[PDB]
Subunit: 265 residues, 4 copies
Amino acid sequence: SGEKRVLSGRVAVVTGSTSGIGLGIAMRLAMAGADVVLNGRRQSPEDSAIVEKVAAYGTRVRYFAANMKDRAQVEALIKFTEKELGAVEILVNNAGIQHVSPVETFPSDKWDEIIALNLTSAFHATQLCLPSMRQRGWGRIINIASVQGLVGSMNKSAYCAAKHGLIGFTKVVALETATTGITCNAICPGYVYTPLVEEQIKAVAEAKYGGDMEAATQAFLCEKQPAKAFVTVEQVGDAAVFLASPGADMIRGTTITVDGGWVAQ
Amino acid sequence: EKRVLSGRVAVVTGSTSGIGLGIAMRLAMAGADVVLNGRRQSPEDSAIVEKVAAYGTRVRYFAANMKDRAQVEALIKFTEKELGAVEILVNNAGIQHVSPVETFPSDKWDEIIALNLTSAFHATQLCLPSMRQRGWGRIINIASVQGLVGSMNKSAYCAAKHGLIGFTKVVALETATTGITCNAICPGYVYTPLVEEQIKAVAEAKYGGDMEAATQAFLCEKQPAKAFVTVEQVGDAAVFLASPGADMIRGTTITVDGGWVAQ
Amino acid sequence: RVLSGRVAVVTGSTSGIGLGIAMRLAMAGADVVLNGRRQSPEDSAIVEKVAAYGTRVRYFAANMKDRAQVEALIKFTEKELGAVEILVNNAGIQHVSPVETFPSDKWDEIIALNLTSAFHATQLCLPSMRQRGWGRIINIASVQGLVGSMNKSAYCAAKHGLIGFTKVVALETATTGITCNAICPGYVYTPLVEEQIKAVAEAKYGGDMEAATQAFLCEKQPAKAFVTVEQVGDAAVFLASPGADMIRGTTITVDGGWVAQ
Amino acid sequence: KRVLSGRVAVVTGSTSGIGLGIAMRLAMAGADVVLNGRRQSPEDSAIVEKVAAYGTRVRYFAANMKDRAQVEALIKFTEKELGAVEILVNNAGIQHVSPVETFPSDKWDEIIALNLTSAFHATQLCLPSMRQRGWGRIINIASVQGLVGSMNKSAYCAAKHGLIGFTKVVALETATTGITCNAICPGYVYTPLVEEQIKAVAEAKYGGDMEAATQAFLCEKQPAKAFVTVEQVGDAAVFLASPGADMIRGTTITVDGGWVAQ
Ligand SMILES: NC(=O)C1=CN([C@@H]2O[C@H](COP(=O)(O)OP(=O)(O)OC[C@H]3O[C@@H](n4cnc5c(N)ncnc54)[C@H](O)[C@@H]3O)[C@@H](O)[C@H]2O)C=CC1
Ligand SMILES: NC(=O)C1=CN([C@@H]2O[C@H](COP(=O)(O)OP(=O)(O)OC[C@H]3O[C@@H](n4cnc5c(N)ncnc54)[C@H](O)[C@@H]3O)[C@@H](O)[C@H]2O)C=CC1
Ligand SMILES: NC(=O)C1=CN([C@@H]2O[C@H](COP(=O)(O)OP(=O)(O)OC[C@H]3O[C@@H](n4cnc5c(N)ncnc54)[C@H](O)[C@@H]3O)[C@@H](O)[C@H]2O)C=CC1
Ligand SMILES: NC(=O)C1=CN([C@@H]2O[C@H](COP(=O)(O)OP(=O)(O)OC[C@H]3O[C@@H](n4cnc5c(N)ncnc54)[C@H](O)[C@@H]3O)[C@@H](O)[C@H]2O)C=CC1
């Protein structure tokens, strides 16, 4: 084996880490030395390959399918990690969904589902992990919020509500743990090119650009993101590694915004 | 009697006591017709209606549980039948539960989210189409300082109030080119039963039942003015938001908090 | 009339937002001292417009960048009308430039007028307000005090700083009858904005002021309409009223949705 | 072999406190560093040695950052000695505690000049080279006092708020380039700037008891009930200077033990 790395020995759980930002975070944590438990909504043929991709960085990697909207499955994910790898030390609440719709016709079940996954599941997971972190005197809770947790955007009422709520939750957890070795913080990405964003760009391309994905992508990006470029899953992962590292011991209850200038204007 | 909100039809949820009643009173004092609302009927409802009717406008009362979307709709339909379209919607009904995160009851978390955030979405969704048809509306969401900052042992409440503020922004952006605005009022501590219960808990835990000491300590921790905000002041902010001078106030917070968030 | 008998000073109230604020304060019953950088032939008519509401109106020319002239303005008010009870720090200027070529003198001027002059005036008025037990300090900030915009580095810095100042003054007075708050307008159609629109009209739109005005407004303001000087005045009256006794150290943003997105 | 290897950094006010901690962490991450203080001191060579312990090139230049000509001389000295300035850390700053009513006019002006305007001058001087090279980092050391207010610190809160507004504009003007501009907002760090305040409070209110004064000073504002360290602020600077921050633009990294969260 090689030299120890900044997070060597730490056990991380990243919810919704079979795709997009969650996978980028899992990869960056593993590259920084952490053991990692990956998670997706359902078992899929691709899980083995993803596990091996993350495990190529030499740490212990596991996978556990669990619907984060079901508190029993959240508990089963945490208990699986405890049995397979050990106490959960880094919890990354990342699993999330989007639904674009004006408020007047926003479906009730979609509103409830976005609240349940993008906000309440983070509460359940944090609640289940905090007692062990307090007993051990160390912890990291990293909540994947959004720029949409700091500002609003049209046709994203439920998502903006949930993400704003997740930031408020973050502050409270940080304050309740402020004199301990546990920190809680949120990362607020701007647009990152994942399926969650690709589906929106496809809707725009069909609606306004005759299917031209290129024009629709440039228009989608430039409406909101002054950099006129996407944030990458690797950059969000680097922010998670930063928050998890010793230099962030006194970063508490705050947002790390990685958004190409979106919230600055 | 030409008053700034004369004839406007207002619905204030959870307005049988506390801040909601203060808001109803100030809206009526400004000339609005007002529909009061409580979770269930009480013998004192006629007295509360009379209090609000002292300002010379049309007052109605409708019992409805804002956590039940069918009852939110019933409240809106009742208002339409009695007074006409809902022109001012004040989403105020709300609850609190103090607990550390580790032991926060799952049911209480869900209830605080349902009433303090999701009920506002349901009422706004039900009222917006009419406001768009009529070319005018006000949606006024009663958030809190706890929607802008965190406080220990209030995880569900801070989450819901932050979310209500995010919701406010989106509604305002979707209506920005119309005569409809949506904004939030963020009070600091107001001396209502929701706060008095907390002060009582602090008094028993830490001050041997002394309510004066407990009250001053409760206020001083958070509120630089060392005094309570009043229900009348919250009502005055609602009147300001509903007035013509606020036609271009959109998606923002009016914080009435004695300096809480300034530090 | 909620402000009847109160004595107000509005800096930079010979045009635009400041004049709208003075009008609204007078309508609410306040006596008002108007102020501009230097005397102008329209001063008499501006006093007359404000005086139409039956209160006492005065005018005093003073460069707010000169502390001695700020003190002269306060002293003139105290002689003519009485103790300053409502202070509106409004006088302000703009200069649009990329950071690299931003003139040093223009940076200094924007800081001096848009931030430091408010400190000087507040410092001069607070002792009387504390003695009386009541006061209102209303700082005219901007959305540019809460977010950034390209080519406005000095102005954004000064307006952010004015908001920070507002918070400190409010905390130092929080247990008194004195409040300090900031109003943060979005775009309002005043000469300060018209000069910017003219520059972009000449550069990009062939001099078409109407087309340029729309493009300028819609870049930043979701309402796709200007905020008015009357609306900013109404916010000032609200902050000066008894309903705002516990509004302290905060921002009243009147911006058509600019900061909400 | 390190993340900032080969980058040339200038840290204003790096002979003490947070600036020295930032210089040390940047050097540890592989950057060459130019140190700076208000004037020459007997300790300068020892400070150079501290930073040079990490195997990079280190230089020192005394310059009053309130004097635009001396800011330019610092930049040109760096260009001559080490090369183009690639990382600019605007850190030099001062404090003065006073109620608004009696706040001295000259102290207000001095705090604005150093804590806000000097950052503007240094940024203006450095941006053309960064644009020519297609890469840059401007890191402004703000404060929690740039996001909320505190009693008796009107000038400082105004300057720090202004520095954050400035940060946003610079970031927006460079958003489509490889130059980023951001601010770090520390809470209380036990430097001379804070030690002086605590000593004043101890004498005025706690009978000279520095333990009691420190506890009260921290407890009033900082929920962690502990100081942030200069090393942690330095780690935040390294993070902002690293490739993972290529798309962090116009924002604040708050390192404050929970101060702004409540
Ligand atoms: N893509 C973007 O631009 C931004 C995304 N985000 C946030 O980042 C997080 C990840 O999003 P993306 O990577 O973009 O999305 P994605 O769609 O690529 O991935 C979502 C992941 O969550 C999992 N997931 C979904 N529902 C689940 C459930 N009920 N239980 C367990 N897992 C579930 C999926 O299996 C997948 O692994 C989300 O919280 C999203 O809100 C935040 C800001 C910007
Ligand atoms: N009291 C305070 O210090 C502050 C309160 N607030 C907010 O103000 C609002 C009002 O609170 P308070 O007046 O303090 O509380 P309160 O307990 O005095 O009044 C709550 C009102 O809501 C009604 N209510 C409760 N559950 C309901 C339901 N399911 N459906 C309909 N009505 C229901 C009650 O009947 C009562 O009329 C809440 O949203 C609260 O979060 C915000 C900031 C500070
Ligand atoms: N117009 C807009 O869109 C916005 C304006 N503001 C602010 O509102 C305030 C007023 O601006 P506008 O009405 O737009 O501009 P304006 O140019 O119409 O009015 C400026 C006023 O300030 C006075 N003034 C200028 N320099 C002065 C000095 N050195 N001493 C004394 N008085 C002086 C002028 O004579 C004039 O009365 C400014 O602080 C500005 O930053 C804020 C947000 C938006
Ligand atoms: N100590 C604290 O708690 C916090 C400090 N800060 C900020 O951190 C920065 C560094 O402050 P500290 O390390 O705490 O103070 P310090 O007093 O320990 O260090 C000040 C440094 O700035 C230099 N300096 C002062 N005036 C100068 C001038 N005119 N030209 C050039 N250099 C000058 C000094 O020589 C010294 O190197 C300041 O901007 C301060 O506002 C921000 C948040 C918290």
